[PDB]
């Protein structure tokens, strides 16, 4: 219900409805337990301070954060650390914005809202899943709710930007990405990390390759769907490598193969 | 929004930008030819009137100066202007 968005029944508090004061709180966006163990180990860290500060600012001056903070940590909300089973990283949010003035941006990568448009990288996603069939028919939404119930940690590497602004966000979360990503490598034993382009393979390198599984591929946005990517190999001794275009790639039948292997469910994707 | 005024002004399309992506230089040159001196953000604007992606390629925020503009066809064939 944080997660099912539909911007035909969207009131969900502005950044600056949401702190007038303009002192930035990240503590109160959180609402999962689960997630207080790694949250803690992050206030206790240097640039946690700067975080809230650097986002403050933003506040001030006065700019249109998104998504809205009860989105911020959607994904997190929705599914505690030991029932995720996939990590899909994005790197910036969607820019964008419907024309009520609803933002494409909810909290989790490459997911919008019901009602409202559908952009490429998604569109290109859907492609995907039909070719391998994984589904029949492209949904008319771009809602993945589903898939993060299931256990689909989608978070984009910068949690937020500005609307209708891209990247302006990007450095200032990179600290707290390395260490959620961190986190989940060190802590939990069985995880798949999809990796979609150059910046989220370069997240994939702090993975531990041995412990869990890596798919790895060009990214789905446009330009980049039908091309390779190409950068160093995971290893000790990294070779330089080239990667398979993102329409190439069977990605949801390798994640639930994989699944099945270990004994766990499979994802279900058709939406 | 100055950056759908660029893609206005260069192809007479009104346009919202759904999504960005920054590409390292060496991956640009791979798409473009030429090499940016730097990173460079692309801007990706759907245009359903021809069916093409509209994309407009720019340096890293704050700066966001113009690069590139490339429209792509149903077919992913790339028409690449240099700005």
Known sequence: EYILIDANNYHFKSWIECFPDCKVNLKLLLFRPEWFDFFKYVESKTYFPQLESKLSSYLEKRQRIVPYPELLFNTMNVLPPGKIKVVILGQDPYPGSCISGVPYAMGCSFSVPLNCPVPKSLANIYTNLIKFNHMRKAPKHGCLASWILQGTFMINSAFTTVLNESGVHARTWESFTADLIDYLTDNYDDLIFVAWGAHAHKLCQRVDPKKHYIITSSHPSPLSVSNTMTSMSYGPNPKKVTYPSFNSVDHFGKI???????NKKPIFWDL | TNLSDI?????????????????????????????????????????????????????????????????????????????
């Open chain 2, 7 to 83: 893609i206005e002004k260069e192809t007479g399309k009104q346009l919202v930008i759904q999504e960005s992506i920054l590409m390292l230089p060496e991956e640009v040159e791979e798409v473009i030819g030429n090499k940016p001196e730097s990173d460079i953000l692309v801007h990706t604007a759907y245009d359903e009137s021809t069916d093409e992606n509209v994309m407009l390629l720019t340096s890293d925020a704050p700066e966001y100066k113009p690069w590139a503009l490339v429209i792509q066809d149903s077919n992913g064939e790339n028409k690449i202007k240099m700005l």
């Open chain 1, 256 to 262: 639930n193969e994989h699944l099945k292997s270990r």
